[PDB]
Amino acid sequence: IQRTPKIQVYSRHPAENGKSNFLNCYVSGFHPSDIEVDLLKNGERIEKVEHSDLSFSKDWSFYLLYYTEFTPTEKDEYACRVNHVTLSQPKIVKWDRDM
């Protein structure tokens, strides 16, 4: 009946400290379409995050891209917080510059 979202947290370009970049959170493989996605900067929600228009794969599962401009540093932690009807609790995935 219902499918859980896949989550990938990554940058548009190779991560380099001091350089301007785009933080992406790509949610996919989920059904139904309603989903809650937050991009986090040290545990706190980034304001005015933009997202792509709702679309879906051949297997009817939906996918969305959430994105914001960001300048990576060594200390700053980034994550993506996702909530969906399949999840009893919000799922948080940390950003790894090597993944």
Added chain:
Amino acid sequence: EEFGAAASF
């Protein structure tokens, strides 16, 4: 361009 005529279920 989209297909104009649609059909009811």
Added chain:
Amino acid sequence: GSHSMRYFYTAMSRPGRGEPRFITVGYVDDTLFVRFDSDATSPRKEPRAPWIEQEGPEYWDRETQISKTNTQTYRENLRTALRYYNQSEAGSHIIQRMYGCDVGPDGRLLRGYDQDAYDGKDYIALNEDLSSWTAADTAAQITQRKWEAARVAEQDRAYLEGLCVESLRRYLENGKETLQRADPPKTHVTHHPISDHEVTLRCWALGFYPAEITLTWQRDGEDQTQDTELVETRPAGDRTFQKWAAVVVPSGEEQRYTCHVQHEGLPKPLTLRWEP
């Protein structure tokens, strides 16, 4: 290369939260060019690619009218589907439609599509012949009977062989800078130790368009399908796409592993290794 145009409908009911939401997105290959959302302030078809902005005001009026009428039709459909499956008016439900055409290098029709789903499950599908239907269950069998009487397959056939390929030919010409340009992947292999005797080799593919790509790891020229971790192709946000393949490797044996890359932007398939 070959090309496709697809439109994607999503009609979602939301009892207690107003009338069902209807969204349409259009694609040429892996590029979004048009959008409609019934929850927009002034609901209409919007451009999402520079090469579709050219189209005159009449084009945009027709396209919007189709979407506004479909918004109404797919609300009726959601009501209809409730009776077909004996469901109450309290739950949220989704009808999805996926239709369009593929063209060969010559711009001739390869095949056409028109299929629907209900709550993520296959409902009805127009067969490759563009004259017969496949219904998933007895509910969709009622829809099939209604469409066979109304000569609906014949209307799809005329569109898929006519307007679908005609407009896609125009779109491919106007957007030839990007739609007919294939960006090859930039590729490298990373090396991260797990243990003292195990290392992760990750084969990266970045900045490639279109999305279709193949990444495989080989151990002594032998595929490692069941031992390769392979993440879903993700969009970079600049039109291009990203993917990686990873393998857990015994330390010392890194040079026995080769990454293999297949993409339409490359004249020949690429073989790469960990370069210490």
